[PDB]
Write a protein that holds these residues in place. Sequence first.
Motif, PDB file in Angstrom:
ATOM      1  N   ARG A   1       0.838  -1.205   0.000  1.00  0.00           N
ATOM      2  CA  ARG A   1       0.000   0.000   0.000  1.00  0.00           C
ATOM      3  C   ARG A   1       0.873   1.256   0.000  1.00  0.00           C
ATOM      4  NH1 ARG A   1      -4.481  -1.270   4.664  1.00  0.00           N
ATOM      5  NH2 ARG A   1      -5.582  -2.968   3.576  1.00  0.00           N
ATOM      6  N   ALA A   2       1.875   1.275   0.866  1.00  0.00           N
ATOM      7  CA  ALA A   2       2.792   2.433   0.968  1.00  0.00           C
ATOM      8  C   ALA A   2       3.638   2.603  -0.299  1.00  0.00           C
ATOM      9  CB  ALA A   2       3.672   2.291   2.197  1.00  0.00           C
ATOM     10  N   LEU A   3       4.195   1.511  -0.809  1.00  0.00           N
ATOM     11  CA  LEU A   3       5.004   1.579  -2.039  1.00  0.00           C
ATOM     12  C   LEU A   3       4.164   2.091  -3.201  1.00  0.00           C
ATOM     13  CD1 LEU A   3       6.916  -1.797  -1.677  1.00  0.00           C
ATOM     14  CD2 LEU A   3       8.046   0.474  -1.978  1.00  0.00           C
ATOM     15  N   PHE A   4       2.971   1.541  -3.338  1.00  0.00           N
ATOM     16  CA  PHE A   4       2.116   1.897  -4.458  1.00  0.00           C
ATOM     17  C   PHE A   4       1.801   3.410  -4.386  1.00  0.00           C
ATOM     18  CE2 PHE A   4      -1.936   1.839  -6.819  1.00  0.00           C
ATOM     19  CZ  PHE A   4      -1.589   1.060  -7.875  1.00  0.00           C
TER      20      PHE A   4
ATOM     21  N   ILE B   1      12.677   3.902   0.578  1.00  0.00           N
ATOM     22  CA  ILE B   1      12.980   3.753  -0.837  1.00  0.00           C
ATOM     23  C   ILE B   1      14.235   4.607  -1.113  1.00  0.00           C
ATOM     24  CG2 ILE B   1      12.122   4.066  -3.162  1.00  0.00           C
ATOM     25  CD1 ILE B   1       9.227   4.174  -2.018  1.00  0.00           C
TER      26      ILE B   1
ATOM     27  N   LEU C   1       9.190   1.849   6.035  1.00  0.00           N
ATOM     28  CA  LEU C   1       9.502   1.523   4.640  1.00  0.00           C
ATOM     29  C   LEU C   1      10.392   2.620   4.080  1.00  0.00           C
ATOM     30  CD1 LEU C   1       8.653  -0.058   1.975  1.00  0.00           C
ATOM     31  CD2 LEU C   1       7.009   1.733   1.546  1.00  0.00           C
TER      32      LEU C   1
ATOM     33  N   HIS D   1       3.294   5.880  -2.669  1.00  0.00           N
ATOM     34  CA  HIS D   1       4.404   6.863  -2.593  1.00  0.00           C
ATOM     35  C   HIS D   1       5.510   6.714  -3.627  1.00  0.00           C
ATOM     36  CE1 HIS D   1       2.640   8.513   0.980  1.00  0.00           C
ATOM     37  NE2 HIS D   1       2.655   7.325   1.553  1.00  0.00           N
ATOM     38  N   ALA D   2       5.487   5.643  -4.407  1.00  0.00           N
ATOM     39  CA  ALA D   2       6.520   5.429  -5.401  1.00  0.00           C
ATOM     40  C   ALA D   2       6.577   6.597  -6.365  1.00  0.00           C
ATOM     41  CB  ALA D   2       6.290   4.113  -6.170  1.00  0.00           C
ATOM     42  N   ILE D   3       7.789   6.987  -6.764  1.00  0.00           N
ATOM     43  CA  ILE D   3       7.959   7.981  -7.819  1.00  0.00           C
ATOM     44  C   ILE D   3       7.773   7.361  -9.211  1.00  0.00           C
ATOM     45  CG2 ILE D   3       9.661   9.449  -8.920  1.00  0.00           C
ATOM     46  CD1 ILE D   3      10.618  10.200  -6.025  1.00  0.00           C
TER      47      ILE D   3
END
Lengths: 114, 115
Positions: A13-16, B111, B109, A18-20
């Motif tokens: 959920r977080a990756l989806f 990145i 998390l 906040h991903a650039i």
Amino acid sequence: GTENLYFQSNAYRALFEHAIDGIFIMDAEGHYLDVNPAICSAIGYTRDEFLALDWGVLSRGVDSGWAAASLARIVGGEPLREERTVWTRNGDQLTVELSAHLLPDGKILGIARD
Amino acid sequence: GTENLYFQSNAYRALFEHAIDGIFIMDAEGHYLDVNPAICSAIGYTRDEFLALDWGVLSRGVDSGWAAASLARIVGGEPLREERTVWTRNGDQLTVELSAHLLPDGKILGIARDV
């Protein structure tokens, strides 16, 4: 411990969100199922517009058979990594590096990077 | 469905494995808990070697207080977004843009992107 589905679901959920990079999910037939904020903003479609599109529309690769050929390689289990020209809603051109990987149930996870 | 527990956890394991960007997980105290292949390759560390590290060591943020202060801000609900230079044990140097977000179970998390 991080080896549980709730942690993993949280992290997705977080990756989806906040991903650039753009992240998308499609079904085995190449219908877009989900698209993250980055990809909606870059390409200029809303989530609801995007979910009415199929693999190949963005890069104008339906008629050529690129969409069908590439989809078949992906569902056969070969990862995709290919640069494609894509067109925004407004008709501007971008070059994106597309990656795609099969999910265990036959859906596809894709990433779109500059 | 693509909202459910099984889908999202499937998708996490795939994205973690296949992401070109670096992805790391740490606990609220700054102990690295997991790291993806992209990070390991970027700095030529193995997963086990990376998991002996604590937040701040790679970017030389221990003495300055940056590691403890930044961790406090994250744990406090302020997402991190800033660049850090990393110095690896074999002498390499790279600059990355870091994002870090508090997760619901108290873990963090991160990145890491080239910049």
